Amino acid sequence: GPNICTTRGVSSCQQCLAVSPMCAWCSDEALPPGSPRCDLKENLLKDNCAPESIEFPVSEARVLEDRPLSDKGSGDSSQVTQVSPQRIALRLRPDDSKNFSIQVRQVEDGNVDLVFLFDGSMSLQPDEFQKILDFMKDVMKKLSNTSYQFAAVQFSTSYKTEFDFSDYVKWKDPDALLKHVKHMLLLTNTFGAINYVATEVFREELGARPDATKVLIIITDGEATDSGNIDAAKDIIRYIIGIGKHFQTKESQETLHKFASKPASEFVKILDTFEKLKDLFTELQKKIRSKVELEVRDLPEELSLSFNATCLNNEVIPGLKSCMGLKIGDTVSFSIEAKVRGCPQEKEKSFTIKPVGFKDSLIVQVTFDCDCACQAQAEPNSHRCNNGNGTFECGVCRCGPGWLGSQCECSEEDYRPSQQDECSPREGQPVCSQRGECLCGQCVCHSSDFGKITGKYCETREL
Numbered sequence: 001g002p003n004i005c006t007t008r009g010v011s012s013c014q015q016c017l018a019v020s021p022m023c024a025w026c027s028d029e030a031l032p033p034g035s036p037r038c039d040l041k042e043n044l045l046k047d048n049c050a051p052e053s054i055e056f057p058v059s060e061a062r063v064l065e066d067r068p069l070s071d072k073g074s075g076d077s078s079q080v081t082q083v084s085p086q087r088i089a090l091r092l093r094p095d096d097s098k099n100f101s102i103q104v105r106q107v108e109d110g111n112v113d114l115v116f117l118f119d120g121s122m123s124l125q126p127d128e129f130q131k132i133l134d135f136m137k138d139v140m141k142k143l144s145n146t147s148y149q150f151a152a153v154q155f156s157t158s159y160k161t162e163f164d165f166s167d168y169v170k171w172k173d174p175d176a177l178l179k180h181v182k183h184m185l186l187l188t189n190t191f192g193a194i195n196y197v198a199t200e201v202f203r204e205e206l207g208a209r210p211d212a213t214k215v216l217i218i219i220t221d222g223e224a225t226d227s228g229n230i231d232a233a234k235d236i237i238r239y240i241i242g243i244g245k246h247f248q249t250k251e252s253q254e255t256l257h258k259f260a261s262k263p264a265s266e267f268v269k270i271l272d273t274f275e276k277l278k279d280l281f282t283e284l285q286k287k288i289r290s291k292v293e294l295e296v297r298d299l300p301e302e303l304s305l306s307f308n309a310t311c312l313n314n315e316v317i318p319g320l321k322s323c324m325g326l327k328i329g330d331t332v333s334f335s336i337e338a339k340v341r342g343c344p345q346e347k348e349k350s351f352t353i354k355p356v357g358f359k360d361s362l363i364v365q366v367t368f369d370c371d372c373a374c375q376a377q378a379e380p381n382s383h384r385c386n387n388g389n390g391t392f393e394c395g396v397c398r399c400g401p402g403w404l405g406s407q408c409e410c411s412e413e414d415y416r417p418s419q420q421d422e423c424s425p426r427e428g429q430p431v432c433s434q435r436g437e438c439l440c441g442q443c444v445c446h447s448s449d450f451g452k453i454t455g456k457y458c459e460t461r462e463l
């Protein structure tokens with residue numbers, strides 16, 4: 001049962017490869033033109049196509065850089081490795097796919113650049129504002145000897161950095177970092193405050209680490225008094241904590257959703273009192289650095305990925321690019337499939353697959369294997385195609401303007417292949433009255449200076 005490679009009526013080696021990854025092509029030259037050309041390599045070999053003429057590329061995945069994951073008890077010896085492998089060379093056929101895998105293992109503490117964006121509006125009692133200050137001092141005192149880095153920004157009507165990352169690293173003293181804070185006692189411009197942090201606090205000159213996890217703890221006691229968008233803070237993991245009587249109604253709590261990351265059930269936290277601020281972050285802190293999540297950069301438009309995750313105790317979750325509830329030294333893995341659509345023009349592209357908050361990454365160098373190697377001697381104007389009327393690449397003719405056929409001979413389109421038996425009017429007769437040649441199931445009459453020959457079967461001579 002002639003399958004996809006044979007059926008599609010292909011006219012060259014390139015679109016034969018473009019039919020399907022399983023298709024191979026024969027370029028024998030010496031072969032009855034109406035023989036099969038695009039088929040599986042086994043079927044091509046089953047007929048007597050010259051075995052060395054067969055073109056059958058195969059997609060492949062080759063590991064280039066495969067530093068092993070670092071173990072627990074790791075000194076910075078050529079730095080630590082948390083993603084393996086780190087570079088892979090992918091070669092893909094037209095519309096083909098190829099799987100690969102990566103192990104991820106959090107070897108190090110986990111670098112987090114955390115910003116406190118705390119409400120300083122007029123609604124806060126002097127004690128409540130102090131509870132917020134002591135909350136931040138508590139968090140920083142509890143995390144002094146970790147890879148956490150802290151910045152704090154008070155916002156009301158205005159936005160003010162009380163200290164940034166370079167200030168925290170330099171002093172490491174929560175009391176001294178916050179001693180100058182004066183309660184603003186004004187409005188609640190949450191939109192502009194989040195934009196301020198995203199562009200004016202998360203900056204490398206001010207101590208921010210470019211590969212660290214960006215976290216935003218927003219503490220507020222009322223709805224925002226400004227408006228706009230926070231597109232500039234899309235790359236920051238944003239928690240928001242609404243505290244007090246102004247978030248009693250579920251309506252008021254829902255206004256906070258657009259400020260926090262998704263889903264709101266994870267990143268929006270509602271409290272009735274400021275006393276519960278100590279215990280609340282204690283639980284938040286457990287989900288900040290306990291999750292590996294794959295992040296795809298520079299993925300070409302013609303490429304699509306699918307992920308199957310093995311997330312501790314061999315729970316094989318199809319669809320997931322993340323695993324949560326991880327500890328130091330745990331190892332997870334992801335099976336990744338990359339399918340291309342057709343064949344892009346730029347034949348070499350790269351992209352990155354990286355865990356959020358990691359410097360380690362997997363770079364995937366892609367090359368698309370679409371052309372046939374028999375473009376070597378493609379013989380334009382070949383004597384196999386009516387002398388000039390066709391280019392002879394890969395053992396067949398690619399017909400120039402006008403002409404058609406196996407050899408570029410049939411000129412005016414026969415269209416419907418039908419049969420050569422439509423060249424003689426009845427079963428046993430010779431074709432074209434013996435005054436012409438059957439070309440693509442249609443008679444083409446012998447030319448003579450003695451007179452024209454016409455008719456469907458070249459029966460009429462005009463002397």
Ligand SMILES: *[C@@H]1O[C@H](CO)[C@@H](O)[C@H](O)[C@H]1NC(C)=O
Pocket residue numbers: 145146
């Ligand atoms: C800070 O914590 C790390 C974590 O083990 C420890 O190795 C280091 O000695 C601590 N520093 C001080 C000054 O205690």
Ligand SMILES: *[C@@H]1O[C@H](CO)[C@@H](O)[C@H](O)[C@H]1NC(C)=O
Pocket residue numbers: 099306307308318335336337
């Ligand atoms: C994910 O698992 C499904 C079912 O086992 C399989 O069909 C698919 O190829 C897998 N994908 C990858 C990228 O391994």
Ligand SMILES: [Ca+2]
Pocket residue numbers: 119121122123124188220221222
């Ligand atoms: Ca308020």
